[PDB]
């Protein structure tokens, strides 16, 4: 059970996947208990007009 707890900690609860610009008004929230190790943020290219998730140039 302890191993299960640590591996679900390791897996990480993905809170967002897809496309988002999050200018003045869009934000993502969490809980004080939910934070144990940190967050992982992955970025890539967008399209100003097409608004399509260009599938290259990650970070």
């Amino acid at each position: 059970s302890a191993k299960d707890y640590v591996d679900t900690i390791g897996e990480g609860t993905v809170i967002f996947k897809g496309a988002n610009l999050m200018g003045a008004g869009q934000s993502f929230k969490w809980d004080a208990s939910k934070l144990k190790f940190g967050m992982t943020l992955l970025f890539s290219r967008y399209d100003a007009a097409n608004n399509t998730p260009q599938d290259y140039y990650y970070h």
């Binding site: 599938d55 290259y56 140039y57």
Partner: protein, 48 residues
Amino acid sequence: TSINGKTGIVDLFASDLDAAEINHTHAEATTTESGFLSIDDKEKLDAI
């Protein structure tokens, strides 16, 4: 499977492969970098 992260019906160009076009211009020649001869320099050379 994919080229530069592109899949399916894909048309690649020079800028897609970080390449220059046929009709592309370079940085003009300065005192520190080589480049294309400026119009003013050519006019001065012709006048001299």
